[PDB]
């Protein structure tokens, strides 16, 4: 499949790259996507739901194998005003939340998770070319299966001033960065 | 002894508290301090140089015997730019690096250590009220005698942005908050 997004077996999936090449986004039956990346360029993608909602609890299973700069998350965006989150589960080489501002840190579904925002200056976005606020959610425990209380990370979120407006796609993602890797992930 | 700075049998010392009440703290022969608390508010006091150096090897022994929130620590700060900066060798009911933003880990003396800092705004300072960062080292290992190779903390620092212009103090302190105690320790 090329970048898009549509439905795939009961859910919506989203899939981006900077079209530098090296990677192949699948998506497989059920809950099922696959990522399989070798030298790529920046992507992300993955499957869940169109909208997404401020208190579901997302269940992700499987197997993730990085080699190099990437990160398994819930990954989504709402509107008015205009946020890319992520709630990182596991990660690769690269720390993503470095040089992000730290805000707190909330326990959450079996560990601490450091808070952070940046900012992300006329960058690619759900609406277009855009400047917007990036909120994160880092786990210390990582793991490749499991379950998210998003209510949790938003509740955390908004009480160190972390508005969320209109919720737009909400998925379970992986992303890669100048890496390679490998990836099966089922969602629910 | 009253809160404030002088030497002692030829070690500097700087004694400070908040004024809420309840810590005695004492010099003894040589190196040596006491601090006795009950019920106290914010302190911290003890023996070292005036100013410390890049490079020092402390030495520190003795007794901490802390109740409550309490930290056993090479305790100094470093000017232009203003820096306070912590090397936490045991500590009580409270980790003092929470909600400090972790940047990384470096080994030294036997032990694994964490590395955070934190931005302190409009707080008392070496200098008056100034906004700074703060700098945390904290021994996974907790220990009351030891010898700390400053050099290596402060190399582990600027890896991630700490830089030394010139340095003041540099102690071995015990501080407490909102708790009681006892302590003697013997630096050289």
Same mark, same amino acid.
């Given at each position: ?10 859910? @919506? ?11 192949? /986004?699948? #998506?497989?039956?059920?809950?099922? @996507? ?40 819930? /990954?989504?965006?709402?509107? #008015? ?12 080489? /690269?720390?993503?939340?470095?040089? +992000? ?28 070319? +855009?400047? @917007? ?6 786990? !210390?425990?990582? !793991? ?13 979120? +908004? ?17 890669? /960065? ?11």
């Amino acid at each position: 499949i090329q970048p898009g997004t549509g439905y795939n077996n009961g859910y @919506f999936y989203s899939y981006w790259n900077d079209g530098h090449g090296g990677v192949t /986004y699948t #998506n497989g039956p059920g809950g099922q @996507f696959s990522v399989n990346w070798s030298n790529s360029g920046d992507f992300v993608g993955g499957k869940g739901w169109q909208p997404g909602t401020k208190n579901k609890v997302i269940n992700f299973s499987g197997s993730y194998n990085p080699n190099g700069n990437s990160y398994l998350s819930v /990954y989504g965006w709402s509107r #008015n005003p205009l946020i890319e989150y992520y709630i990182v589960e596991n990660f690769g080489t /690269y720390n993503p939340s470095t040089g +992000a501002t730290k805000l707190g840190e909330v326990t959450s579904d079996g560990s601490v998770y450091d808070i952070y925002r940046t900012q992300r200056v006329n960058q690619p976005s759900i609406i277009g070319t +855009a400047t @917007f606020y990036q909120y994160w959610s880092v786990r !210390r425990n990582h !793991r490749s299966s499991g379950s998210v209380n998003t209510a949790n990370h938003f509740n955390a979120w +908004a009480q160190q001033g972390l508005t969320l407006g209109t919720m737009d796609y909400q998925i379970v993602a992986v992303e890669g /960065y100048f890496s390679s890797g490998s990836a099966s992930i089922t969602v629910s």
